Design a protein around this ligand. Sequence first.
Ligand code: GGB
Ligand code: GGB
Ligand code: GGB
Ligand code: GGB
Ligand code: GGB
Ligand code: GGB
Lengths: 292, 292, 292, 292, 292, 292
Amino acid sequence: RIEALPTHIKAQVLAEALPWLKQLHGKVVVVKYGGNAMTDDTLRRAFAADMAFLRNCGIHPVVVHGGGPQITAMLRRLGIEGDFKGGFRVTTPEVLDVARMVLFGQVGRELVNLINAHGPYAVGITGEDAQLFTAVRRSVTVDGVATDIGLVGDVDQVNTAAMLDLVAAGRIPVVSTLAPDADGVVHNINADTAAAAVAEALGAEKLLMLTDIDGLYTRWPDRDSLVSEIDTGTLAQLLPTLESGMVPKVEACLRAVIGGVPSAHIIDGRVTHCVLVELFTDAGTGTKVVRG
Amino acid sequence: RIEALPTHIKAQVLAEALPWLKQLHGKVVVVKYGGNAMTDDTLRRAFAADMAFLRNCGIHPVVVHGGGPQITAMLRRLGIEGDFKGGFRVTTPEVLDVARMVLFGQVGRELVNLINAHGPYAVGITGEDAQLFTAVRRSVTVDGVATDIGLVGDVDQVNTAAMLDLVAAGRIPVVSTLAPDADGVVHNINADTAAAAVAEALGAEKLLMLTDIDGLYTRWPDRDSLVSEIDTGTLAQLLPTLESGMVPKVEACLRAVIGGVPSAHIIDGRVTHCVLVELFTDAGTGTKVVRG
Amino acid sequence: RIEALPTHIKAQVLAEALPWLKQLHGKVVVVKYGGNAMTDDTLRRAFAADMAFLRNCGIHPVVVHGGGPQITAMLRRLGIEGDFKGGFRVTTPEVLDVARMVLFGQVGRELVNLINAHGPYAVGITGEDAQLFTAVRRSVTVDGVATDIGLVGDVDQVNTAAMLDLVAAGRIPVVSTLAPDADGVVHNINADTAAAAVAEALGAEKLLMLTDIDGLYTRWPDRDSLVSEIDTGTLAQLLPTLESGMVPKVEACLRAVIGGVPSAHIIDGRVTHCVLVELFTDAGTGTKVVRG
Amino acid sequence: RIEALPTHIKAQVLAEALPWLKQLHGKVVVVKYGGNAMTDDTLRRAFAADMAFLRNCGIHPVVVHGGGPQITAMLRRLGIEGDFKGGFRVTTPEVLDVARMVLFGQVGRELVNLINAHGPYAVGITGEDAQLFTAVRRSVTVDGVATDIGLVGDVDQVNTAAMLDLVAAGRIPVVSTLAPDADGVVHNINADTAAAAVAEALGAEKLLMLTDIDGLYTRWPDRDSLVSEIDTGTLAQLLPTLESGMVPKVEACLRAVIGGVPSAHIIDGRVTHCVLVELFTDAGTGTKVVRG
Amino acid sequence: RIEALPTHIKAQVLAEALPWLKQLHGKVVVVKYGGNAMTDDTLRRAFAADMAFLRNCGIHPVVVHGGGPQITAMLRRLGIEGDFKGGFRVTTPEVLDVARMVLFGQVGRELVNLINAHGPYAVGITGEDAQLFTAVRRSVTVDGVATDIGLVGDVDQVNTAAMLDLVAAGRIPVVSTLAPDADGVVHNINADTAAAAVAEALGAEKLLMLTDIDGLYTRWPDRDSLVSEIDTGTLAQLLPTLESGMVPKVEACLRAVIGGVPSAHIIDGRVTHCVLVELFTDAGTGTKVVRG
Amino acid sequence: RIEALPTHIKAQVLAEALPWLKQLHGKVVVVKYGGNAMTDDTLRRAFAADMAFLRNCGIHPVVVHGGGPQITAMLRRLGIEGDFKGGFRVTTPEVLDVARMVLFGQVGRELVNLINAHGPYAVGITGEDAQLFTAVRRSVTVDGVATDIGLVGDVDQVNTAAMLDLVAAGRIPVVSTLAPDADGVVHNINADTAAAAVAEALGAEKLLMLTDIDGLYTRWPDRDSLVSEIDTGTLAQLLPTLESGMVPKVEACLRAVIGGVPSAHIIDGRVTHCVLVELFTDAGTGTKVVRG
Ligand SMILES: N=C(N)NOCC[C@H](N)C(=O)O
Ligand SMILES: N=C(N)NOCC[C@H](N)C(=O)O
Ligand SMILES: N=C(N)NOCC[C@H](N)C(=O)O
Ligand SMILES: N=C(N)NOCC[C@H](N)C(=O)O
Ligand SMILES: N=C(N)NOCC[C@H](N)C(=O)O
Ligand SMILES: N=C(N)NOCC[C@H](N)C(=O)O
């Protein structure tokens, strides 16, 4: 029902992209890709087409993906019983091997192949490859005490130079968030915190975080709570109040934007081509976070 | 009235651009710019924004402009009485100096400045600069006899290499169609034939020719005559029948597409952002000419 | 017991490497890595140190790995019952996903990490990444009739240029042999045939094929059958007689050396640092195949 | 009468050029070109040959030209009556358009074509092209009060990098002194002040200012007043005493040499090949200004 | 007595250099340097200044030097008695060592140091260094029988690429004519034949051969015999008639010009700055040889 | 008797080279070459093969050579009687010419030719060529008074950049230690002090100094005095006690290692392939000097 669209309306949608093309040309955009945007075929195919879009505009997308539920599925099919502290599964060496094998050997593969239907762009990588980035073991807090939950950590250091060589070669890196610690022992890294760490280290112009909601509600569930733009100051003050589902997506945006990334975006991964809408439209389809 | 546009319609307009972004990324597009698209301020400002659009997509636009009516105006303000053979003004050395001074020193200037509101892109050039291209004197036919009408000719040879150096540097060349002959004497070149010559020599992916009409009508004025796509074979057979206004715009498309340019486009310069519409929409806003 | 080695013997071992350093400097060496050389920790750690050796000589190693037994293990742990035609497991879409996930997400990972203890060298890749190479479905012969056994094939075409860009950047590619067909459907490729295909396409100076035996015996099990050098002519004539374990390793050497690779080597992966011995010693530790 | 020149005299003239070739090789020389050196055909043809000379020595000439009298002529032929404050014509938007069209579209054109008889060297440019330099509106002083005289100003900022890219490509820039202000409105810039501004910004080794006199007389009209070398200190003290014709040519030399340009030269544009004489002869044909 | 030279005469000498600067810019000139031009201090210092001149014009000089008499002197001071067949000294391994040590270690050194007073330009080389060129043993004819006279030969092959790398780096190669044969045994090469061989292999624009005479006399000693220009056809026919001193200098010019070198020049090394005179003056100071 | 070497011993010798290959890959090694390592043919041929070894590992060797005894021999064959102050021969301009001619024109030549049997690597150079380094006249102390002994000095400044261009081009520089002072007058430089000066200026990873002894004895002639590793602190304190033969070799190591060179090595030039042994074996064959 878009043949029926008069040509002067198509003209104005295209033209409205100009200031965003100009702000992003030759710049890197880190895209955290997860949620339904990763399970419905229409949404995924469109997300892949959009990484190609950016690349065919001379924009440099970097995709960081998660895959928590597919790990648990494979761990269940292998009969690997988990140990849990608080709400956390302990990542034994056995669980890491499965997580790595699932993230890198299955979930990364499907994205690379989708993107590569448009051309020779996607390349899968972890922190292990060429020592592109390292991890540092992180503990969590259960009942306000810090606790070890196995081979889990945060991005420690990033080989910024070698990373930017990959995208100057015209490649879209699909990053599975696994990385060696300083002793060579590979950890699993939360894909949200990692996308923010990669955004900051690569000097990204934008960090996009796909989620399964319209945007951020300041006082959920009040419908009026929805905000389209917000700065780090007010947002950090709202943080110890939001739903548990958005605390990590917000902490990532805070860390990124304060880390120098001009804007981070919490966008609706249920919207087809949500990437194109947030980047090339003034209104967008999510919450834009800036510093202030 | 485009805030009112639902976000999923904006999504589909943007997404439909993908296969054209991919076909044009890193490619040169020669755009012949004339007609009303050059006299109404809204249209011109939009045409300038569109050259910047292409450039901010990693596309390489080259603008060839005419300016026949502004020359006649200046010739009238200078009281330079013309001599006419057939319907042709003889281009004396005096008329060339005015034509060059008007084309290069006024009409080219306004475009360069418009485009350059978006950034350091436009550079004005003639065939004289760096010997970028030469001319060869052409005669016309009045009553079926070939006749001399002064310092007028066709593009003879083009410095393809130096031309492509200019656009690899990220510059949009605004070409005033004046060029030296083999003896150094500068001629004026019809901007339509020149755009086709520059398209062919630069290996352009598309030649766009802005005119003041919807597209080509095969049996004007029959409304049903309008065609959106047509090949060189059928088109060359329609040529000794169309209106006098479109014979040059068609001959250029023939010469270009047969010269290897994959497609030439006769598009409506009265449509705002007509460049964006023909390039990034499947339907377009003109007639597409291919070989066949 | 090598402190006890007199310094003039260490001198002569080192010096004897000179003509091989000279023949290989700046050249690519494809190394097919499998067998025990991939299951005993001492052998694997030494194999990793040797890829670093080559790289620290300005030699360009490319590692192609298999992993048949680890796939069958994982298929067993997942309870995926196989279908068999002849001695062949049918590779359903389900088996491919496991094979890819095991080859790329586990077996490739361990090598990359081993090599990367020496520095930022190893990068895992499949034919899917950047469309580095494609596959073409192959059938097998059961009882002399050609038979379909699922998503299995041969290397079809190789992106030679992009491959050599990777190693000019100083990277050691660890190749998991999975590749998309012309329709995008990923197949599993026998690592032996693939190493020979990659050798030929990259213009490799040598193809090394690690196996679990001293070398090739012409009339096994006669101890006198062992040959240290042999040409394609005599070897192709010996082929329909050897043990079933060596027919693929020999066919690969034939295809490579006839494909222009100056020499292919069937070397003993049970010998620690077997790579260093075959490359930098005149005698070697395997069978050298040349054309003749 | 130069066949009659003995070969050992030709030898010594050539040899005396050596220390100046060495001081200028690979260096930029800004040449302000005006006066009779621009109206007599022998002088102009020789000036063009000399820009080619420099370029065929690996020297990088940059030509800044004026053209005040040709503007007034065209303004008279168009019947554009001027408004005058003091001795200054007000530069209305109409006068700017004529000035730009004359400077860029006629006077620049003739030089480019002359130079280009020797090869593909000359390219005409203004501050508008690629935003190569901007202007800032300047007022003048009539009777010691500062007064607005329209769209006239000084060079504000220069795109040093893009300028030096042009001459590293082997091109001789012919600069028409028109430039946009910070709002995009194009002004006309006095060619003398502009040549000094371009000299300083490009790190020029020398600024040559062609005039219609032997050199600078310190107490004109005393014949003994002529000086061949002088420093900024003494010269700035002589400035509020010289003829009105030389105050701008001197202020330019002061601004340049104090701006870091090692020497500025006021040379006689009535001398054929005056450029060659001042640059490659110890004596020169003008006044050399240094710092002190 | 050149202060007394009016400035308009200095102008015309300089200007007359233009077409030769243009023909030689970026081109290599092989200069065979010998005779008195190598023994009188004024002449040598001027010859060195002239190599710097060429280099400071973006011209690429290559100097090939001889030194026959200084070898005989050193052989006499060492008491090495010679053996002679015909008029030829047999070049024993002992004589080669002296010749190499004199040519490379003394005569080359003085030139390099002279040239390098003007800057970091000269570098001494033989065919031994980087295998820049090889030799092939040549026999001579005594009484019409070909005879061995030791380690003497002709330039066999030249590393054109590595040679042109040296001059693109901005270096003036001072070539001592010694080169290894295919077995590594170094021979001495006649500097005249070698300069012609280096001219041909480097694609030189000109070969200059300094001698101790005005130019070539066709029927010496007739004063009218002197010719300023001559082609290979007529010259080869004059060859079995000239003085013994010029047969090698002519054979070199023939071999070079027929080898594709546009012109070879036999110029008077007794004229100060003879290089500058022949290159940058229309008349020259020698005989110019062209093909015809 | 090295065929008899079991393959697993050859394996371990090769493998033990890995950490040294890694520490030296892409790094420059200055090698001072003198003593018997320069007079016995087996040792010299092996030393040449070893420079090729380094180069075929992507290591950048730079050879500094002496040749004191061959100078005295030639001075004797020429009957040039010397003048002596203390134990020092005065270097008259005559002696310099012989020294330069011997060092550069004979001793350098033989090494270049030896090395070049392995490929196009060696190039002979002095400080005179391209002004690669200068000298400063040095006086010596006879009976504790500083005394002039002619044209002798120390390396003053080094053209680090142009030097490293030579080795990035893949060339092994054979350096004859002669260099011009600031006035252009060439001096002879002690090859030991020069190797240390070149090591420091090029940022060398190691300086190797070949001598005619096992290593450094701290209290010669006590056999127990031999040390395999020692730091600058203890070594400088041992210096005013060692044999006269090693004071210069030690002072060079001190100056180098304190100059930032990570380690200097005094190795036994009587050991065949002593370079390979000290570099690629943990034990070495000399004394390693580090800072401490
Ligand atoms: N307000 C929100 N959440 N989005 O609108 C901003 C989108 C704009 N294209 C940008 O990239 O900044
Ligand atoms: N049918 C016409 N006239 N235009 O539609 C084709 C437009 C398409 N973007 C192209 O560039 O080919
Ligand atoms: N004969 C056998 N199988 N090996 O010896 C040859 C090894 C040699 N380094 C080579 O790389 O050719
Ligand atoms: N004295 C005067 N005015 N000129 O002589 C100096 C000219 C010299 N070639 C230079 O470029 O400095
Ligand atoms: N006629 C003789 N011998 N010389 O005059 C020619 C010189 C000219 N510069 C050239 O380089 O060709
Ligand atoms: N101890 C001595 N003298 N040598 O052993 C050290 C050698 C080691 N390859 C190095 O290059 O440091």
